[PDB]
Scaffold this active site. Structure first.
Site, mmCIF file in Angstrom:
data_model
loop_
_atom_site.group_PDB
_atom_site.id
_atom_site.type_symbol
_atom_site.label_atom_id
_atom_site.label_comp_id
_atom_site.label_asym_id
_atom_site.label_seq_id
_atom_site.Cartn_x
_atom_site.Cartn_y
_atom_site.Cartn_z
ATOM 1 C CE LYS A 17 -3.205 -7.458 4.340
ATOM 2 N NZ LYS A 17 -3.321 -5.981 4.166
ATOM 3 C CE1 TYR A 24 -2.642 -3.248 0.368
ATOM 4 C CE2 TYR A 24 -3.127 -2.699 2.656
ATOM 5 C CZ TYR A 24 -3.238 -3.560 1.561
ATOM 6 O OH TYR A 24 -3.976 -4.721 1.644
ATOM 7 C CB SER A 80 -13.202 -6.526 -1.485
ATOM 8 O OG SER A 80 -11.934 -6.110 -1.949
ATOM 9 C CG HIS A 116 -0.183 -8.748 0.664
ATOM 10 N ND1 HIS A 116 0.239 -7.438 0.735
ATOM 11 C CD2 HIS A 116 -1.507 -8.699 0.385
ATOM 12 C CE1 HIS A 116 -0.785 -6.632 0.511
ATOM 13 N NE2 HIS A 116 -1.858 -7.373 0.304
ATOM 14 C CD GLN A 139 -23.220 4.849 6.939
ATOM 15 O OE1 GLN A 139 -23.284 3.862 6.208
ATOM 16 N NE2 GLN A 139 -23.550 6.066 6.526
HETATM 17 N N1 LIG Z 1 -5.409 -9.101 -1.086
HETATM 18 C C1 LIG Z 1 -5.589 -8.495 0.085
HETATM 19 O O1 LIG Z 1 -5.061 -8.898 1.137
HETATM 20 C C2 LIG Z 1 -6.544 -7.322 0.134
HETATM 21 C C3 LIG Z 1 -7.301 -6.972 -0.984
HETATM 22 C C4 LIG Z 1 -8.222 -5.945 -0.901
HETATM 23 C C5 LIG Z 1 -8.369 -5.264 0.285
HETATM 24 N N2 LIG Z 1 -7.606 -5.592 1.349
HETATM 25 C C6 LIG Z 1 -7.538 -4.782 2.655
HETATM 26 O O2 LIG Z 1 -8.812 -4.739 3.218
HETATM 27 C C7 LIG Z 1 -9.501 -3.569 2.738
HETATM 28 C C8 LIG Z 1 -10.623 -4.105 1.891
HETATM 29 O O3 LIG Z 1 -11.406 -3.052 1.362
HETATM 30 P P1 LIG Z 1 -11.307 -2.629 -0.165
HETATM 31 O O4 LIG Z 1 -10.171 -1.691 -0.302
HETATM 32 O O5 LIG Z 1 -11.434 -3.761 -1.107
HETATM 33 O O6 LIG Z 1 -12.690 -1.819 -0.171
HETATM 34 P P2 LIG Z 1 -14.023 -1.897 0.711
HETATM 35 O O7 LIG Z 1 -13.796 -2.039 2.168
HETATM 36 O O8 LIG Z 1 -14.859 -3.035 0.199
HETATM 37 O O9 LIG Z 1 -14.780 -0.479 0.411
HETATM 38 C C9 LIG Z 1 -15.044 -0.148 -0.964
HETATM 39 C C10 LIG Z 1 -15.483 1.290 -0.975
HETATM 40 O O10 LIG Z 1 -16.648 1.442 -0.137
HETATM 41 C C11 LIG Z 1 -16.745 2.805 0.231
HETATM 42 N N3 LIG Z 1 -17.415 2.902 1.519
HETATM 43 C C12 LIG Z 1 -16.874 2.691 2.763
HETATM 44 N N4 LIG Z 1 -17.735 2.808 3.744
HETATM 45 C C13 LIG Z 1 -18.924 3.126 3.105
HETATM 46 C C14 LIG Z 1 -20.220 3.402 3.585
HETATM 47 N N5 LIG Z 1 -20.550 3.399 4.884
HETATM 48 N N6 LIG Z 1 -21.176 3.702 2.679
HETATM 49 C C15 LIG Z 1 -20.847 3.729 1.384
HETATM 50 N N7 LIG Z 1 -19.661 3.494 0.814
HETATM 51 C C16 LIG Z 1 -18.737 3.193 1.733
HETATM 52 C C17 LIG Z 1 -15.322 3.365 0.235
HETATM 53 O O11 LIG Z 1 -15.295 4.623 -0.468
HETATM 54 P P3 LIG Z 1 -14.774 5.967 0.235
HETATM 55 O O12 LIG Z 1 -13.275 5.872 0.456
HETATM 56 O O13 LIG Z 1 -15.201 7.082 -0.732
HETATM 57 O O14 LIG Z 1 -15.600 6.111 1.499
HETATM 58 C C18 LIG Z 1 -14.462 2.272 -0.415
HETATM 59 O O15 LIG Z 1 -13.613 2.752 -1.455
HETATM 60 C C19 LIG Z 1 -8.439 -2.723 2.009
HETATM 61 O O16 LIG Z 1 -8.465 -1.329 2.296
HETATM 62 C C20 LIG Z 1 -7.121 -3.333 2.488
HETATM 63 O O17 LIG Z 1 -6.767 -2.845 3.778
HETATM 64 C C21 LIG Z 1 -6.729 -6.610 1.303
HETATM 65 C C1 LIG Z 2 -1.501 -2.909 -6.654
HETATM 66 C C2 LIG Z 2 -2.961 -2.461 -6.465
HETATM 67 C C3 LIG Z 2 -3.870 -3.599 -6.641
HETATM 68 C C4 LIG Z 2 -5.324 -3.243 -6.607
HETATM 69 N N1 LIG Z 2 -5.778 -2.031 -6.905
HETATM 70 N N2 LIG Z 2 -7.137 -2.156 -6.907
HETATM 71 C C5 LIG Z 2 -7.469 -3.479 -6.580
HETATM 72 C C6 LIG Z 2 -6.337 -4.172 -6.361
HETATM 73 C C7 LIG Z 2 -6.384 -5.592 -5.843
HETATM 74 C C8 LIG Z 2 -5.664 -5.669 -4.499
HETATM 75 C C9 LIG Z 2 -4.700 -6.644 -4.257
HETATM 76 C C10 LIG Z 2 -4.107 -6.760 -3.006
HETATM 77 O O1 LIG Z 2 -3.137 -7.670 -2.676
HETATM 78 C C11 LIG Z 2 -2.883 -8.722 -3.599
HETATM 79 C C12 LIG Z 2 -4.471 -5.897 -1.966
HETATM 80 O O2 LIG Z 2 -3.925 -6.081 -0.737
HETATM 81 C C13 LIG Z 2 -5.425 -4.906 -2.256
HETATM 82 N N3 LIG Z 2 -5.849 -3.948 -1.245
HETATM 83 O O3 LIG Z 2 -5.432 -4.088 -0.111
HETATM 84 O O4 LIG Z 2 -6.615 -3.052 -1.571
HETATM 85 C C14 LIG Z 2 -6.014 -4.787 -3.487
HETATM 86 C C15 LIG Z 2 -7.838 -5.996 -5.678
HETATM 87 C C16 LIG Z 2 -8.108 -7.189 -4.966
HETATM 88 N N4 LIG Z 2 -8.376 -8.141 -4.390
HETATM 89 C C17 LIG Z 2 -8.892 -5.239 -6.069
HETATM 90 N N5 LIG Z 2 -10.187 -5.551 -5.994
HETATM 91 O O5 LIG Z 2 -8.745 -3.940 -6.489
#
Ligand SMILES: NC(=O)c1ccc[n+]([C@@H]2O[C@H](COP(=O)([O-])OP(=O)(O)OC[C@H]3O[C@@H](n4cnc5c(N)ncnc54)[C@H](OP(=O)(O)O)[C@@H]3O)[C@@H](O)[C@H]2O)c1
Ligand SMILES: CCCc1n[nH]c2c1[C@@H](c1cc(OC)c(O)c([N+](=O)[O-])c1)C(C#N)=C(N)O2
Length: 318
Positions: free
Chosen positions: A79, A50, A212, A112, A274
């Site tokens: 991670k 990130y 997500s 990760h 929220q």
């Molecule tokens: N491979 C991995 O390990 C991996 C992959 C993806 C994510 N993650 C981690 O876990 C998190 C997963 O979340 P994500 O990034 O995929 O997105 P997410 O949590 O599913 O949220 C998607 C979008 O929802 C919006 N949102 C948040 N709260 C809301 C609400 N109360 N009402 C309406 N919209 C709302 C946000 O927009 P705004 O910013 O405009 O509020 C955000 O961009 C990441 O930030 C990261 O830390 C890990």
């Molecule tokens: C390099 C940017 C990749 C990226 N930009 N937008 C994305 C990604 C993917 C992602 C992969 C990740 O680790 C493999 C990760 O940790 C995170 N994260 O934390 O948001 C996001 C992803 C998924 N799943 C989705 N849905 O959207």
């Protein structure tokens, strides 16, 4: 509040996602993480990927310095990125994360992704033709290095992200295993609820952590923009109206009552606040069952290049 991990530590069941696309200013990570803590978040999810560990760590230090929290009030995750799977590279990776965040230890260090990449300092290494360069690593050895990270007191707990059941068994059935993974952080939401993997993880006392959970940030570099918008779902909205909440709150609450620890990213102060409201209400047994029936086997992550990776977790599709 929390869940007990299989190593005797505790993880808060609501976590704050800190990743934002690079079009967003990096300082914003510092500002919004302070906001999330101010709002009641205690679990903070970051990563080397990130590129924000400095700012997230500065937020954590900030709220400790002004007396809002103790370090042990804070569950901080980072991670190991996929260019550092080879076992001699793991502790150096973790030490660099701690140095960037200016923290002495992470509460949780994860693999990760199971999809290993060319070692080095490019996070996204490519060839002369611009195709991503994979690497081949026995993740059991990577895990052994992770275990030493726990023993060295650098990580409180250790776990994985983006593993399927097959890849978990591989660690679980490892000869001379010291620590099982405390969690598996995987894409998980009403259109991809991962019920089979969830039931496996519970069987193994492994927490599933949903990312997500709100349908992703729909970054069109990694997500098909014409995929259904999770939070515009009929059922989620009807339920939102039933409970006088929001679709997001319903999506979050959903996971909590399945025994899934849930992440939520927001960079908007009002939406950050929220989201902590998830603890204010409950869904009925009938509501839960209705959200179960939404499953569409749909992961938002979409990438042709990574799908051909040998350890692509979703390769059964195809
Ligand atoms: N491979 C991995 O390990 C991996 C992959 C993806 C994510 N993650 C981690 O876990 C998190 C997963 O979340 P994500 O990034 O995929 O997105 P997410 O949590 O599913 O949220 C998607 C979008 O929802 C919006 N949102 C948040 N709260 C809301 C609400 N109360 N009402 C309406 N919209 C709302 C946000 O927009 P705004 O910013 O405009 O509020 C955000 O961009 C990441 O930030 C990261 O830390 C890990
Ligand atoms: C390099 C940017 C990749 C990226 N930009 N937008 C994305 C990604 C993917 C992602 C992969 C990740 O680790 C493999 C990760 O940790 C995170 N994260 O934390 O948001 C996001 C992803 C998924 N799943 C989705 N849905 O959207």
């Amino acid at each position: 509040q929390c869940v007990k991990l299989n190593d005797g530590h505790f993880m808060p069941v609501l976590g704050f996602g800190t990743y934002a696309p690079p079009e967003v200013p990096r300082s914003k990570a510092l500002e919004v993480t302070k906001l999330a803590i101010e709002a009641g978040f205690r679990h903070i999810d970051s990563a080397h990927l990130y590129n924000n560990e400095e700012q997230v760590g500065l937020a954590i230090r900030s709220k400790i310095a002004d007396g809002s929290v103790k370090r042990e009030d804070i569950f901080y995750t980072s991670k190991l990125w996929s260019t550092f799977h080879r076992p001699e590279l793991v502790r150096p990776a973790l030490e660099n994360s701690l140095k960037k965040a200016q923290l002495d230890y992470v509460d949780l260090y994860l693999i990760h992704s199971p999809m290993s990449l060319k070692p080095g300092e490019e996070l996204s290494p490519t060839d002369e033709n611009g195709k991503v360069i994979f690497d081949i690593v026995d993740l059991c050895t990577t895990w052994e290095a992770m275990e030493k990270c726990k023993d060295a007191g650098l990580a409180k707990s250790i776990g994985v992200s983006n593993f399927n059941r097959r890849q978990l068994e591989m660690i679980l059935n490892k000869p001379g295993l010291k620590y099982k993974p405390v969690c598996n952080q995987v894409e998980c939401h009403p259109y991809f609820n991962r019920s089979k993997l969830l039931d496996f993880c519970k069987s193994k006392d492994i927490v599933l952590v949903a990312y997500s959970a709100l349908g992703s940030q729909r970054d069109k570099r990694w997500v098909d923009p014409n995929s259904p918008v999770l939070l515009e779902d009929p059922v989620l909205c009807a339920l939102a109206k039933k409970h006088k909440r929001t679709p997001a709150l319903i999506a979050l609450r959903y996971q909590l009552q399945r025994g899934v620890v849930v992440l939520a990213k927001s960079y908007n102060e009002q939406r950050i606040r929220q989201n902590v409201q998830v603890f204010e209400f409950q869904l009925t047994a009938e509501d839960m069952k209705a959200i179960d029936g939404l499953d569409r086997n749909l992961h938002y992550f979409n990438s042709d290049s990574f799908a051909s990776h040998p350890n692509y977790p979703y390769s059964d599709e195809y």
